[model samples]
Target: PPSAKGTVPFGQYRTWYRVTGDLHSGKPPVVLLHGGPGSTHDYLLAMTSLTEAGWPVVHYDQLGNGGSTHLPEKGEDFWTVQLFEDELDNLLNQLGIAGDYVLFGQSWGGMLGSVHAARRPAGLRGLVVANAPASMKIWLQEMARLRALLPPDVQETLLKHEAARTTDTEEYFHAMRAFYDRHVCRIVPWPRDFAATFMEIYNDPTVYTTMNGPNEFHVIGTLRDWSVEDCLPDIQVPTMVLIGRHDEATPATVKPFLDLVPDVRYEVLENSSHVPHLEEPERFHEVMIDYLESLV
Candidate 1:
């Protein structure tokens, strides 16, 4: 069945949400946090399978993006991480799902989830930090490493455009798609669901630009120095760190969690890049569900 979509209060704005399957079943709900301080929850459609198999699922567009509420004028100071954190808590409370829930976050979403879990929230039974970076310092380092793997011509083009700061040009985006194709989502043409969320950011990138800079590899935004490596031990829940064999969130990016999170599991999706849900839905769901079920 399709999800039921609506909005919840978040400060003076509204946070858009979707609930797929039976939230009333007493099963712990799965909350999927989309990447991009700017990305919408559309691409995470893959999680509906969890609902199909009897687990409820929740997806929300973080404030300032998608259906929630758009604030294209918001700048660095206004789009702080705490704003999103508060928005998430407000959502969980408003939905009444805060009591028992498993949160799965990708990329930027993973960073937020990590910060939230580090607080040792009372009801967070499990966390899935998928294809996320623990340190933006390390994240930039890995991005440089991945840049070297790009075709020499592609690397030159990326550097040329980034140095010139003309990221808005079509040629620049073409260069970006090269990296995206190799490490973001290898699926050619980007499935509509995935493309939609991505394009939504470009449509109005206030949040993305304020928090994450021009594109995936660049980190000139406010969160350029954000890191949670020191707090890894504080994340007391049973956490799983997922990375793709050819992911941008490569082994180097995910090592901190494996080495520090008190109790952690690590898995690599062999056929995927950044988005395993879109690249290998069946396998991703199997691995994800197995872990979620293990908790209850």
Candidate 2:
């Protein structure tokens, strides 16, 4: 099997993508969706391990970030979910796999995938939602609950900075890190790929800051009230909901899919947080491979 990397021409831009292994190897390609509503495909590259199992893996940066077109000047109106959904469709068609493919989305990527799946794309075969909240309402509530468990001083600092609209300060970032350490990725020192995604998010935050806010726990962006719960019931494919036991997504935040998706398999990695791929790669890949294999 050979690997390939290139760009797919979008309407006025190009989508950067990498394919590991052969898409024609009798197995549907597992397309990965990175988080941040703007994060790169860098972190999720770990899942390309699926290629070894004979499943071609597809990874791409959405239009506004990463290797794709950078639109720092684009405003909120230009970064709608529909735009991303269209970009994904264009990518699939250009790659000639829109007729048969699987989606594996994490966090915001998971949420976006749900929206795409709800539309019942004819090409979709399987769906995996990892560490994603079904609704922003539930997500924010859980975030508040998790924030309460943070050190009192840390919580106060976060609130203070958010209120002052000065979240760019080191004090706020240091406090935000406290929450991230406990929930985002428990891997000490953080993995290089994971850090790379964060760095990219920091470099061109136009998409993330406009859609998902300054940081994970602080939700004040355009999509703060967004909810894909109604759309979940409309999904027509076998779906797997993957979560880390200590995930910021939280059980309650993800329960809607289990309750709504017609066919759903739920798995929790007990010793992991938001990023099980980095926190517990072995188990994470095992679970992913098992579920994806089951689909075949």
Residue-by-residue lDDT tens digits, candidate 1, 1-296: 45577898787889999998878696888888888778889888878888767889998899888998898777779998889889989999999988889999999899899999999999899999999989999999999999998889989989998999998889988989999998999998789999888888878899988888998888899989889888789998999998888899989988999999989999999999999988988899999988988888
- Residue 195's C-alpha lDDT in candidate 2? 90
Backbone atom clashes (below 3 Å) for every candidate: 0, 0
Candidate number of the best TM-score: 2
With candidate 1 superimposed using the best TM-score fit, by how many Å does residue 165's alpha carbon deviate from the native? Answer: 0.9
lDDT of candidate 2 over 64-168, digit per residue (tens): 899899988889899899999999899999999999999999998899999999999998988999999999989999999999999999999999999999999
Q: In candidate 1, list every pair of residues with a backbone clash.
A: none
Worst 10 residues of 1 by lDDT: 1-10
Candidate 1 accuracy as TM-score: 0.97
